[model samples]
Target: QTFSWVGRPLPNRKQFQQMYREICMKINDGSEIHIKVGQFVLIQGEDNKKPYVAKLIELFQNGAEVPPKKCARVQWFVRFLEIPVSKRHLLGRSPPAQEIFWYDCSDWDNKINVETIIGPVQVVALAPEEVIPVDQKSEETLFVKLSWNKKDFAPLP
Candidate 1:
């Protein structure tokens, strides 16, 4: 696997400022990539598809074996182009390429193997009243304004 925890995995418990959940990997550019829960990251996508953007919510292993299955619980983000056609009318206009909407799936099945993570990505949260100027948009940065619920096509106010 490309990613591995920095130190020995610890039992999941309440701790202060602990780094047990952090992982590191080398990207294609031969540079080190560090990731931890609560940060945004890029998941390996299918062929011809852009890497799926996600926030690492939780990290754990199935067992204490030498190399147990390392997994992560993530919150997914959907790009404007990837939004379902039926839900597109929620927004008044097309969102910028780097603008993404958060769609959380907190079910037990939302966990994925740590190997699927490619690297960390930068995502900036925006207040509902805030707007990004055209010059501030870039491929490396993603902006989020509201969340879309898949259950009822309801969007955050």
Candidate 2:
């Protein structure tokens, strides 16, 4: 379907909720994109940070108030810079700048209005033995070679 923002948010919990499989959004370049739960997206970050990369885990609508709002539940990627130096040794090698980790732990909450989503992002999920060429690294592509669960000190390397 077409993409458009309805209006105002439901302050408290006075809204209805419904699940959705996909939604369409327009980009700054005047193009539209269809986003589904399994795809990756670049969300507008807060505090002047760079666009954040995340995988859409779920899509739903909240309508407890007058105007309806679209919401996205995302699984966040922990950036290289975000990891502590103490934990860096677990990687066994110096990780690439574009390399990010998917946190399987559920300690943090990650729900945002659909409007916060800037656009789609290209995330290359690397196989255990695959290595991308340095030339392939660019603003348009991010690489993920592991999934980390800090609670378990888990690394799916």
Candidate 3:
């Protein structure tokens, strides 16, 4: 699909740093921001079973600059958040175990109406539990659906 913002220059590193800091601060200060479909979240966390660092990819949002477009026409973008691995506790423990979850944007009527809808996107990470087993990939992909408009903005549901 054709994305209005695709190929657009992302803010410079310094600007991104500032924006990242501000986003984190908002989270810390109890302000929630919705993470729309087609939007990416840069998550850094440790693989619970291994020492490796994992950067999870949260796919872009669904919908179109205007309605009635193909899914291929959509553009995806990501924003980096805090690096969870860097904040390991001194006791050799990480923060409470966390699970990365996402909702699919397919069911939205907009998926068909919009030129593009964030469709069939998957969440990927190095964690074993998070791995998309090859055999179940299709099923898992179908199971994820964008459920509500309210929770779309923030990292948390």
Can you write out model 3's per-residue Cα lDDT over 22-133, one digit (the tens) per residue?
1111243455443333433332224342121111222222333354222222222221122233322322322222223233233312212122222233333333234334
Give the Cα-based TM-score of candidate 3 against the true structure. 0.18
- What TM-score does model 2 achieve against the real structure? 0.76
* lDDT (Cα) of model 1: 0.74
Full candidate order by lDDT, most accurate first? 2, 1, 3
How well does each candidate superpose onto the true structure, as a TM-score?
Answer: 0.78, 0.76, 0.18
- Per-residue lDDT of 70-107 in model 2, one digit per residue for the tens? 88899998776666777777767777667778877677
lDDT of each: 0.74, 0.74, 0.27
Error of 3 at 98 (Å): 21
* Steric clashes per prediction: 0, 5, 25
Q: List the residue pairs that clash in candidate 1.
A: none
In the range 73-113, model 1's lDDT, one tens digit per residue, is 78888777667788787676767777788875554256788
